[PDB]
Amino acid sequence: MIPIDDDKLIMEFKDDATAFDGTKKARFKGKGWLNAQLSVIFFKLLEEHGIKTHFIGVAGGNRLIVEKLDMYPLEVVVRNVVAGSLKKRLPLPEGYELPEPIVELYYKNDELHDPMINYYHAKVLGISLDEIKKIEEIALKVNEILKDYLAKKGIILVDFKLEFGKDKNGDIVLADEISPDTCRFWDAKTKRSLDKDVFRFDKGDLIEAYKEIYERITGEKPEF
Amino acid sequence: MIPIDDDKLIMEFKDDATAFDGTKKARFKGKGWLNAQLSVIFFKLLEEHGIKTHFIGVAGGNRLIVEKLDMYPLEVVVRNVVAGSLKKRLPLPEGYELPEPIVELYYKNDELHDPMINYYHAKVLGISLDEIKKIEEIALKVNEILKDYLAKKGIILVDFKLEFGKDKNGDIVLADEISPDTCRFWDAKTKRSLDKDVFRFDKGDLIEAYKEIYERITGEKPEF
Ligand SMILES: Cc1cn([C@H]2C[C@H](O)[C@@H](COP(=O)(O)OP(=O)(O)O)O2)c(=O)[nH]c1=O
Ligand SMILES: Cc1cn([C@H]2C[C@H](O)[C@@H](COP(=O)(O)OP(=O)(O)O)O2)c(=O)[nH]c1=O
């Protein structure tokens, strides 16, 4: 994030990785580039499907030109398969296939460590019920488009996180990024993680896993 | 809770008090009796206002006859003033007056320590959106009736917890108890706790505080 004018800014993807409220850190040469390219591909797929996103263009390498937005202080999580923190909320095992998608709202607040909230907390934070409902509707639509597109490539979309903001017309626009950092991707054949869980739980090689996704999505080996 | 037949059971209120997931325990001679009497008064007030509750009758002392129900595995929390765990979810101080009531759903599960959930988790637990909406509507109605009744007696209803079950007609019925154990009651004049927070945070004498509520509500000193 680095400003350009009133209408747009630069989003730069870095090689840095963090986990567990920032207590785990490492750097992976090439991750910024992979995450940038993959966000681009995802943003363009969603745009074709009529999802408003902040993507404007590529600013070479690890940099995207994105629309400026009044950002909602939310992380919006959609879950298809039980994994991560959902295991501490429902007595269901890792890999449990949900009967329908779960949407969870988290309040972006470092002091409180991003606690889960509901519609009522959101309202006190200044987000109307109508806004929340539009946000969840978009998230669920994004889920269908991504889940289908990836299943046709042997990838299970386990869960993912989105962020949103409001544009000058008061429309709700998909923001941040969509990448193996912010999604769980499982190989359909083997159930193995091809995402940030590789780094989180030391499941092998992060760069190999992200390359895997990139190759399996684009049909080409990453040039860098 | 001790069975009678298919239609009804006994709910006995004991002198035992627990806090902090059961790590804090103590006994207060007379608390069972106070909590029983106060639940009776609250249940009867709500019934007059058209709230369906499980209250059937008094079985002498600390015992109520209550209707048997298919219990939802929920604790339903309504909040008017910021206190307790809400302070860890919203960066708002103790005593902050909410612009409108907050309803929170907790999944009753000791293994998971009663985590907060939303409508989607509820659905996976087998509770339909329609049920959840009816449950919250009742809770918000209970809030208005109790808040008004108590304000007319110099008591601020800060927050409280309800439980619910389904009767043989599939109607949603208010269950468990309503007492200084399951509500925050503040003196309007002084802001002091007249509830289980006295025991939770060692704010003085629990029995005196509960007697206070009882005297201030009934207009009479507790006979036991
Ligand atoms: C809460 C949160 C989730 N996510 C993504 C990662 C996962 O794909 C999905 C669900 O995460 P979750 O299981 O809730 O948390 P954790 O990553 O700590 O196990 O949402 C983020 O990228 N950032 C966040 O701050
Ligand atoms: C979660 C929970 C709340 N409550 C009641 C007590 C309070 O009046 C209100 C809000 O409680 P809360 O502040 O969420 O938890 P704590 O009591 O740990 O501070 O709901 C219960 O009686 N039992 C429960 O298990």
Side-chain angles (χ1 to χ4, degrees), chain A residues 3-5 8-13 15-28 30-87 89-110 112-167 169-188 190-219 222 224, chain B residues 3-5 8-13 15-28 30-87 89-110 112-167 169-188 190-219 222 224:
Chain A
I4 289 176
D5 49 25
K8 49 176 86 86
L9 66 147
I10 289 306
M11 180 166 68
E12 191 182 57
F13 287 79
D15 285 356
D16 304 314
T18 170
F20 309 112
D21 267 327
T23 62
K24 188 175 187 175
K25 293 158 176 182
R27 304 182 70 267
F28 298 89
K31 182 174 91 65
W33 191 91
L34 289 158
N35 285 354
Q37 301 306 307
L38 288 168
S39 302
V40 164
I41 289 159
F42 289 130
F43 284 139
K44 289 170 164 174
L45 171 77
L46 299 175
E47 287 283 350
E48 296 180 338
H49 287 75
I51 302 294
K52 285 221 200 78
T53 82
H54 72 162
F55 179 69
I56 295 179
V58 289
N62 302 5
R63 289 180 286 272
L64 318 194
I65 304 161
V66 294
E67 186 186 4
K68 186 163 194 171
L69 299 175
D70 185 2
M71 295 291 296
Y72 292 104
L74 297 169
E75 286 153 353
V76 183
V77 176
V78 183
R79 326 187 75 118
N80 303 301
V81 173
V82 172
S85 73
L86 190 56
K87 291 189 295 198
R89 214 172 286 284
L90 294 170
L92 298 173
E94 174 97 5
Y96 188 101
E97 167 101 300
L98 294 162
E100 64 280 319
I102 292 175
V103 183
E104 312 174 331
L105 306 163
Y106 293 86
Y107 173 37
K108 272 179 81 64
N109 182 299
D110 295 301
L112 303 175
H113 315 296
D114 293 3
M116 207 183 71
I117 52 161
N118 64 33
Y119 308 165
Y120 295 88
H121 312 284
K123 175 79 179 173
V124 176
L125 289 167
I127 311 164
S128 68
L129 187 55
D130 162 68
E131 288 168 284
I132 278 301
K133 285 184 175 162
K134 272 161 172 76
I135 289 161
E136 298 193 335
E137 165 180 34
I138 295 154
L140 285 174
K141 187 185 164 169
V142 169
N143 186 47
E144 292 306 296
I145 302 156
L146 298 183
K147 185 161 68 90
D148 294 335
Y149 170 92
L150 295 162
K152 296 208 262 72
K153 279 149 209 274
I155 296 158
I156 296 159
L157 181 62
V158 164
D159 57 34
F160 58 99
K161 173 223 94 196
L162 303 174
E163 300 186 19
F164 290 91
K166 215 141 78 165
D167 71 19
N169 293 333
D171 288 339
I172 296 162
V173 178
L174 186 66
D176 202 52
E177 72 178 292
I178 303 174
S179 74
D181 275 18
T182 62
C183 304
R184 285 190 172 98
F185 295 138
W186 286 3
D187 168 78
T190 58
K191 271 34 168 160
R192 58 193 276 275
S193 291
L194 307 168
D195 53 47
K196 195 166 144 176
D197 275 346
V198 170
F199 161 74
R200 286 184 195 106
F201 306 111
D202 302 316
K203 289 187 169 189
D205 192 280
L206 179 126
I207 290 295
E208 295 321 304
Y210 286 33
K211 277 176 177 155
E212 264 260 61
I213 289 293
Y214 185 100
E215 282 167 76
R216 210 135 130 209
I217 278 173
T218 69
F224 295 93
Chain B
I4 289 176
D5 49 25
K8 49 176 86 86
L9 66 147
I10 289 306
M11 180 166 68
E12 191 182 57
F13 287 79
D15 285 356
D16 304 314
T18 170
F20 309 112
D21 267 327
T23 62
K24 188 175 187 175
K25 293 158 176 182
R27 304 182 70 267
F28 298 89
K31 182 174 91 65
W33 191 91
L34 289 158
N35 285 354
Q37 301 306 307
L38 288 168
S39 302
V40 164
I41 289 159
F42 289 130
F43 284 139
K44 289 170 164 174
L45 171 77
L46 299 175
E47 287 283 350
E48 296 180 338
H49 287 75
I51 302 294
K52 285 221 200 78
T53 82
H54 72 162
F55 179 69
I56 295 179
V58 289
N62 302 5
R63 289 180 286 272
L64 318 194
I65 304 161
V66 294
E67 186 186 4
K68 186 163 194 171
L69 299 175
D70 185 2
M71 295 291 296
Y72 292 104
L74 297 169
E75 286 153 353
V76 183
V77 176
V78 183
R79 326 187 75 118
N80 303 301
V81 173
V82 172
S85 73
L86 190 56
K87 291 189 295 198
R89 214 172 286 284
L90 294 170
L92 298 173
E94 174 97 5
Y96 188 101
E97 167 101 300
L98 294 162
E100 64 280 319
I102 292 175
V103 183
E104 312 174 331
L105 306 163
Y106 293 86
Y107 173 37
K108 272 179 81 64
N109 182 299
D110 295 301
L112 303 175
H113 315 296
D114 293 3
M116 207 183 71
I117 52 161
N118 64 33
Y119 308 165
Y120 295 88
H121 312 284
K123 175 79 179 173
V124 176
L125 289 167
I127 311 164
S128 68
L129 187 55
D130 162 68
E131 288 168 284
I132 278 301
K133 285 184 175 162
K134 272 161 172 76
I135 289 161
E136 298 193 335
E137 165 180 34
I138 295 154
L140 285 174
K141 187 185 164 169
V142 169
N143 186 47
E144 292 306 296
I145 302 156
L146 298 183
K147 185 161 68 90
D148 294 335
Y149 170 92
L150 295 162
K152 296 208 262 72
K153 279 149 209 274
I155 296 158
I156 296 159
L157 181 62
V158 164
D159 57 34
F160 58 99
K161 173 223 94 196
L162 303 174
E163 300 186 19
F164 290 91
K166 215 141 78 165
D167 71 19
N169 293 333
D171 288 339
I172 296 162
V173 178
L174 186 66
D176 202 52
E177 72 178 292
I178 303 174
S179 74
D181 275 18
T182 62
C183 304
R184 285 190 172 98
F185 295 138
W186 286 3
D187 168 78
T190 58
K191 271 34 168 160
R192 58 193 276 275
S193 291
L194 307 168
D195 53 47
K196 195 166 144 176
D197 275 346
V198 170
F199 161 74
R200 286 184 195 106
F201 306 111
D202 302 316
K203 289 187 169 189
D205 192 280
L206 179 126
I207 290 295
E208 295 321 304
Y210 286 33
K211 277 176 177 155
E212 264 260 61
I213 289 293
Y214 185 100
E215 282 167 76
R216 210 135 130 209
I217 278 173
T218 69
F224 295 93

